[PDB]
Amino acid sequence: SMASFKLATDLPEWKKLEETYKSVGEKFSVRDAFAKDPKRFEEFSWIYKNYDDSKILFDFSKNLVNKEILDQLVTLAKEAGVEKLRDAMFAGDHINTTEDRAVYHVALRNRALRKMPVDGKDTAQEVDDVLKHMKEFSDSIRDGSWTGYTGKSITDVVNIGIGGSDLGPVMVTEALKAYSKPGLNVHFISNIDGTHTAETLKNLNPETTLFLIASKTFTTAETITNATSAKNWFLATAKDSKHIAKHFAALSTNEKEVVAFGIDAKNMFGFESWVGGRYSVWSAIGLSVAIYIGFENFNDFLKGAEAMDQHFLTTPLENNIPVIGGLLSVWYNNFFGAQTHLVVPFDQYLHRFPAYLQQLSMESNGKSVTRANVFTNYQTGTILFGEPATNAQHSFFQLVHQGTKLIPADFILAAQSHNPIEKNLHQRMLASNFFAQSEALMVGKDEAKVKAEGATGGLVPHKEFSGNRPTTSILAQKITPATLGSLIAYYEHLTFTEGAIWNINSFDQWGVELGKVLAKVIGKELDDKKAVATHDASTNGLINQFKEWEE
Amino acid sequence: SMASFKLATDLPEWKKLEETYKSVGEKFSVRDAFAKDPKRFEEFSWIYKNYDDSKILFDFSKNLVNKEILDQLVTLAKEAGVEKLRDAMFAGDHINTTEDRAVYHVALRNRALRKMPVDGKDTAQEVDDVLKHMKEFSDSIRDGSWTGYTGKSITDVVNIGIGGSDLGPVMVTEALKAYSKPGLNVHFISNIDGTHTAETLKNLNPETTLFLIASKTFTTAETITNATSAKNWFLATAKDSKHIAKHFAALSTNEKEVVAFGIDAKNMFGFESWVGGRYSVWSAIGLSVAIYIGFENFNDFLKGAEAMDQHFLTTPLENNIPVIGGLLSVWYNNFFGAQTHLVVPFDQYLHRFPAYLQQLSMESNGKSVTRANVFTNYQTGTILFGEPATNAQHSFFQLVHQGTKLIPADFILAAQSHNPIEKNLHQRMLASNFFAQSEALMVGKDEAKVKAEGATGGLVPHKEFSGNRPTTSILAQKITPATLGSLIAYYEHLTFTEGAIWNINSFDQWGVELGKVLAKVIGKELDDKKAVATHDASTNGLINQFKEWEE
Numbered sequence A, B: 001s002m003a004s005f006k007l008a009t010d011l012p013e014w015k016k017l018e019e020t021y022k023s024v025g026e027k028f029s030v031r032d033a034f035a036k037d038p039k040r041f042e043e044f045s046w047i048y049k050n051y052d053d054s055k056i057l058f059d060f061s062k063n064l065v066n067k068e069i070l071d072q073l074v075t076l077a078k079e080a081g082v083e084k085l086r087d088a089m090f091a092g093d094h095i096n097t098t099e100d101r102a103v104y105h106v107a108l109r110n111r112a113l114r115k116m117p118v119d120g121k122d123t124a125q126e127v128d129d130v131l132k133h134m135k136e137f138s139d140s141i142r143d144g145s146w147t148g149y150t151g152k153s154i155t156d157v158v159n160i161g162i163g164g165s166d167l168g169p170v171m172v173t174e175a176l177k178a179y180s181k182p183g184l185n186v187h188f189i190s191n192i193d194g195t196h197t198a199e200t201l202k203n204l205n206p207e208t209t210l211f212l213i214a215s216k217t218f219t220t221a222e223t224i225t226n227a228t229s230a231k232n233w234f235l236a237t238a239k240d241s242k243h244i245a246k247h248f249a250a251l252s253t254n255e256k257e258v259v260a261f262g263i264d265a266k267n268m269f270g271f272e273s274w275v276g277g278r279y280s281v282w283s284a285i286g287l288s289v290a291i292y293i294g295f296e297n298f299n300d301f302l303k304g305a306e307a308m309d310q311h312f313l314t315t316p317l318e319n320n321i322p323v324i325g326g327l328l329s330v331w332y333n334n335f336f337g338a339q340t341h342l343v344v345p346f347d348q349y350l351h352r353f354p355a356y357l358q359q360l361s362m363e364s365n366g367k368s369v370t371r372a373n374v375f376t377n378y379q380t381g382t383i384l385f386g387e388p389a390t391n392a393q394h395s396f397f398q399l400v401h402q403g404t405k406l407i408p409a410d411f412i413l414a415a416q417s418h419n420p421i422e423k424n425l426h427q428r429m430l431a432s433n434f435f436a437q438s439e440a441l442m443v444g445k446d447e448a449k450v451k452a453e454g455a456t457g458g459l460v461p462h463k464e465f466s467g468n469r470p471t472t473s474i475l476a477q478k479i480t481p482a483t484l485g486s487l488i489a490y491y492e493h494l495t496f497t498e499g500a501i502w503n504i505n506s507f508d509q510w511g512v513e514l515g516k517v518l519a520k521v522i523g524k525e526l527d528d529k530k531a532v533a534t535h536d537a538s539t540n541g542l543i544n545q546f547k548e549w550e551e
């Protein structure tokens, strides 16, 4: 399973891209590119067709890229063996080398029931069987047939989990909230901070609340603590532990720990080690989604991911949409030295989409060691950030337009709103902003125009805009379950691409693994009341100041 | 009002800091610094005492800084005239040069009624008079005496506004939600996206809902549109426009536009041009806060800001807490070339604190032109991001620990929880994470330790942690109104400092001003149905694809 090369900087096309950066890239004029190439929009935009014949336009043409540059980036991808690694992923090979695991989120959305084996054994029916369990259970919650311990239908579902066991369910239930039904609400406890439990459960009724304990390992400190506190809250009213079986289910890989916690095995929704947390919403972890919007919508979301998987698998690199996205990220990160990537949904439902992508991206690609087990001498993962528009335009877009940092940005809009109020007035205004913002980042406003518009003397430079600030625009028809499925999978495969070029393992997380063992030593120290002198002086000082100030 | 210098790079200490970066900074060992200096925690931490005798510890000692470096940064601040600009701000001078305005958020929290003049006229009583109006109105909402058009008490208050007229109210009501009362809820419509209106108003009763239309200009497109749609929603039930007077108030500078919209002048809460939006929560814009948690709590929040103002005004630079913070930001941005700054509250109530600071920071300091009206040839504002812990630890902290990017970070914890459930178990665990995370970023884990812990061969590098990754830890006793007031003001004055060194105008926003006129041309084009060919080919293509896909 070893690597075909050591460092990205070893790939012969890397030095050629450095040369191209110097001669064409650094000074690249997007205005000039459009003037030189009447077909530029056609050449640097791609329509994706989803399984339901809906469409998404990916327009890359406002980026600092042309045919020469993209052809060089494609050659780099071939040298890096992006296709070989991708094929190994889809083959169920153990490409997560450091944990010796398969990387098989693609198998979770295999609705076609293709043969998709791990360790030589097809996963298709095992995955499907969990999905059938999810459909049966979510249907029974939604139709009222699953009753709580006093015989009432469930009104509230509380997911308890953190990281990969939280953020997908949050983001996707928010994104697809138009598909929810009145009277059936979802909630998400994740932070160990007791505020999260107290505020979430404050107004809920134990008789009509169902908890889903979401944990791959079922040993995570925060989650098991939160789950215990919720069980205590439930039993304060319900009294008898026999009633737990109607109110607690588990989403997990670890049957022994689930049962040991006192959940019935029948109420476990399983998944496997080859599902990374930040790739897990497609699994049993998405049960809150199926409950909130219905299993059929959840299934449509999976099929959207599957269609984008097939696109990534089958398309030559030069027309492969997630690959192009990933190649542009490498271009900016490693040649321009842009440390960040901005993601801006022009969509209020997608308000937690940037935060989700931040996990996906940064937890996958924030690595310093390659598959050849040497340290990198070049940049890896970027820092991702964002908020929805139009809010963002009034905020940090000031810096995006007039600051000193290059910030590659992705803007996303649906042509149709789920909420086309006031005869679509609000939607037309939203869309006008989408178009005009990316236009303005490209066109800018030169000295002569500032003067024509009435500024004189020392005010003029203050009102200039450089332009040639790059954007990618992604236009969907509508943010349906299927569309969101395809969009997430796009970003998954974009992340894949970047990581393949950098020659890192996109699929481990030894810093978040360390995080889950770090705090125990200090926790024991906070339990007894003596002052501490066992760490560095800052840690000791902070701890001791805390001890003086704590309740 | 002109500048004493052109470019930061002209300041004699700038080149000296470049030299210090090369010889001491680049290779700085924080472990070595603690070993060399037994008093390092004491020397690089400061206790702030608030007006109510509560305290906040600011520990900078895990930063890449020592006495030599900090003394050089202080000298740079003196060369840049940070104190002169600060004194001009507090004097009511028109230091927002490009708009020729005073910068006088500090006057909003002048509870001491010091003489604080703009254009030679004291502002103290005018500010106070608005606050007395806010107290009377918020008291009458809270006590039930302000009734809606059918004679019922108000149960829901909806703020409508965007940017500076939204994010402060959102963040501060979230942060201080422990101080709210059952049955009186606040809501925030901001996005033009009609989803925001539809979802917010779905379950509200027009008879018991009060709107606050928050707009400095009272002409912002999104806000006036949202406000109109809310008025339409209200009148669909209420029928008669005479009932608007019991249900709509305005937070604004622009009395003529407010009345013209059909709000009663008596229900206007005014503020002045010298309040920037991203500095406005202290003004009439904070009315939702006063309603949600009570005017006395709002006033305590102002007094916390006032105390931090007095600290910033009166403290020599070497012990001036916001200045030190700002100097470290310049150090990382301009000498290390770190493009970002991470802010992580170990506090679920403060979940929107990073987003608020993102506006404050990036909208203030994302500028390319100095007070001498020349373009910069060095980096200005950083990109700010963050999410609360412990969630963030499971997410992008992977990259913070093991990626290739330097990411200066601020961690914030309260020693006491408003929600100390389970005999403070959750709070002790939260705090243990706070300490352990910053410890781990500093200490790292070398090759020998990885081997001792059981890794062999090619796995070892994958599990190494560099350490020497910097953090600032801020420990409060409790996040009270007063504490939050002081914390925001800290960041305001930190932002001030950075901008003063860069010699930019922290107080204009010509990119967000452009944003509010950009979209109108395209909006007219989306109104008629013909295809468009009036822009660049990408803009035209996106618009035309939208037209094919739109309802």
Ligand SMILES: O=C(O)[C@@H](O)[C@H](O)[C@H](O)COP(=O)(O)O
Binding pocket: A162, A163, A164, A165, A214, A215, A216, A217, A218, A219, A220, A223, A276, A277, A278, A363, A509, A512, B394, B395
């Ligand atoms: O990305 C990850 O691996 C983490 O965010 C995990 O999802 C998080 O630690 C929760 O782990 P578990 O699902 O085992 O409870």
Ligand SMILES: O=C(O)[C@@H](O)[C@H](O)[C@H](O)COP(=O)(O)O
Binding pocket: A394, A395, B162, B163, B164, B165, B214, B215, B216, B217, B218, B219, B220, B223, B276, B277, B278, B363, B509, B512
């Ligand atoms: O920071 C700013 O200036 C903007 O975010 C404004 O707050 C926003 O545009 C709203 O402007 P107004 O308060 O005039 O409606």
Ligand SMILES: Cn1ncc(Br)c1N
Binding pocket: A329, A341, A357, A358, A360, A361, A362, A365, A382, A384, A491, A492, A494, A495, A498
């Ligand atoms: C660079 N990038 N942008 C979004 C995502 Br997900 C990644 N990895």
Ligand SMILES: Cn1ncc(Br)c1N
Binding pocket: B329, B341, B357, B358, B360, B361, B362, B365, B382, B384, B491, B492, B494, B495, B498
């Ligand atoms: C650098 N920085 N960190 C927080 C804020 Br507010 C700013 N300007």
